[PDB]
């Protein structure tokens, strides 16, 4: 029923953990590919192992997350010999992801020349928008660096490229990004990453409930739906299409991803509800959105992919 | 307890409506006046009277609200005269609050011009950040624009003047926009008005839920909290002393409120509660905030008032 097409590859469904989110070390990523997931992809790497931010640095609320990890990570050619040595086992339906957040332009270029360079033959996901990193300004909401870089990275990356974007907010906002996009190559595009930059607060201790940058994090989980689904949906409607979408945003049940799918995303990652639940709620949403699809007489994707009803 | 000091003026309590909420005609204003809120503030009114979008336009959530209401008012010129008559009866402990959102730069000068040339003894709050007009952007998305408006204000603008703001996701467009605002003698800011262009589907349907703009609505509620908590508080930290804040976003209940205090908060203006409650909220919400008070050993707000703790 869930049978998904994507970058020209076959995948069993469109499930897949949201980078960050149970994919940090080896362990993690076996876990995934013994999952129901449809796909998955690694955390986003940096040249150099990264301990990341002071802990407590994630907290789980009742309506989603918050966040400021720092980009803990176990660095670029760690995962890359992972992915390369997966590859060769033949031993998953369709190719892994692979995230890169450089913390320059010249860290991206250097690790997408690696990659173009290795024998990857997976896909690649350039994370345009880490709000976690305090003096990294989120890249893809300075539109002139986000064109400058892509148009460097195009004069030599030939692999499948998908960018993660941060939500935005204003229609004209999506207007000029998607001109941007819309002029390369680009395999798709993720929306969203974490609203940034929010703030939960401890009422009983006055007090934050994260350490780094004074308690301000990156909102996830049902908090964000609404936001994440505008994205996905706006960048639908603009997007030429050739450039495919992966919808990430408060993710839990079959029904927020009947939702997402709706509004035209193609791939699903979860975030905080994976990080909650574990690897098990791949099996449970697959058979959520199974069972919304026989009560509506749907046996495809297609049946419904991208028909959101204006009234 | 709740006896606050804002634009050298005296309130009973920090509450107020949220503009655009409860406030639409002078029996809505009546109603506020007579209700336990500390001061009321107007629809944002434009030159001419406005029946805003087609309907449907406002929905509740279970999790807040989605609306795109395109500004319906009675006009400019109704809102003055109804607070001009008001203001001479001196039946309430402290002013009025009067908003204006021009659907252009030289229509904002225009209604500031009357505001000034009036005996309009309130206080002003300009809208900066209506995301619901077709065609319209966020002006306060523009700090280029937002700059040039201001500086033209303040050659001519000599009365009591607020900004009402969208908010920000990036720790960069909150120092720039600090440094925009801290130039001016602002009497204040007004973080946050609703996020902005956000969906919400009803999936049976398989449909959106609001008839303007495909759907796309301004997001209020416990869904904007963490957003709207953090935009006040970085505000807080960069605005010079004599710029104070107003707190608006996700506000039902006295913990909310706290919380929005303890950021950096002055007043605080409640919207999607107040619309489905109606105006008693104002009597549970006072206790319920001096109940909290009271059990922490607090007397008055300035116990407590910006000493967000953190980590
Ligand atoms: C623990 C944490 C770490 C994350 N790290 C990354 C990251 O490495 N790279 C990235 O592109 N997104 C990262 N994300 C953002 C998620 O990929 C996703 O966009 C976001 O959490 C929203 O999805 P959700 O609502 O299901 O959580 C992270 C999220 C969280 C919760
Ligand atoms: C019905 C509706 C109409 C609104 N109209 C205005 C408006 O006229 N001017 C304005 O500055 N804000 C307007 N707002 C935004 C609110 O003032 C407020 O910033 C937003 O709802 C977030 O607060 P809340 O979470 O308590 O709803 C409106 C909100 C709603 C719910
Ligand atoms: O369309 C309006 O009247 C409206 C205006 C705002 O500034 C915010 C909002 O959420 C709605
Ligand atoms: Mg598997
Ligand atoms: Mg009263």
Redesign the interface.
């Known amino acids: 029923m869930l049978n998904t097409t994507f970058a020209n590859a076959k995948f069993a469904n469109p499930f897949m953990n949201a980078s960050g989110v149970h994919c940090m070390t080896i362990e993690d990523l076996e876990e995934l590919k013994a999952s129901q997931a449809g796909a998955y992809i690694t955390k986003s790497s940096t040249l150099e192992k990264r301990e990341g931010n002071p802990l ?1 640095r994630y907290v789980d609320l009742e ?1 989603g997350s ?1 966040n400021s990890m720092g980009l803990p990570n176990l660095g670029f050619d760690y995962y890359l010999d992972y992915v390369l040595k997966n590859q060769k086992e033949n031993a998953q339906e369709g190719p892994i992801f692979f995230s890169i957040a450089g913390m320059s332009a010249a860290e991206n270029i250097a690790m997408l020349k690696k990659i173009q360079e290795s024998d990857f033959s997976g896909i690649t996901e350039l994370n345009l928008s880490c ?1 976690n990193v ?1 003096g990294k ?2 890249l893809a ?1 300075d539109f002139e660096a986000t064109e400058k870089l892509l148009k460097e990275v195009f004069t030599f990356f030939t692999k499948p490229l998908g960018v993660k974007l ?8 999506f207007d000029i990004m998607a001109e941007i996009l819309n002029q390369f190559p680009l395999t798709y595009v993720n929306s969203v990453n974490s ?7 401890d ?1 009983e ?7 780094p ?4 994090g990156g ?1 996830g989980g ?3 739906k ?2 994440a ?2 994205n996905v ?2 960048f639908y ?1 603009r997007l030429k299409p050739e450039i495919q979408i992966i919808g990430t945003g408060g993710i839990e049940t079959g ?1 927020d991803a ?2 997402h799918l ?2 035209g995303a193609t791939m699903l990652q979860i975030g905080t509800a994976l990080h909650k639940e574990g690897p098990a709620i791949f099996d449970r949403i697959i058979k959520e959105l199974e069972e ?1 699809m026989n009560q509506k007489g749907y046996q495809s994707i297609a049946d ?1 992919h991208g ?5």
């Open positions: 407590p309506l918050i709000p305090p300004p989120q909401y941060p939500p935005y907010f204003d229609l004209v906002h609203i940034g930059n929010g703030l939960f607060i009422p201790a006055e007090s934050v409930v994260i350490k940058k004074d308690g301000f909102i049902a908090y964000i609404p936001t689904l505008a949906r706006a409607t029904q009947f939702e709706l509004c919304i419904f028909k959101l009803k204006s009234l």
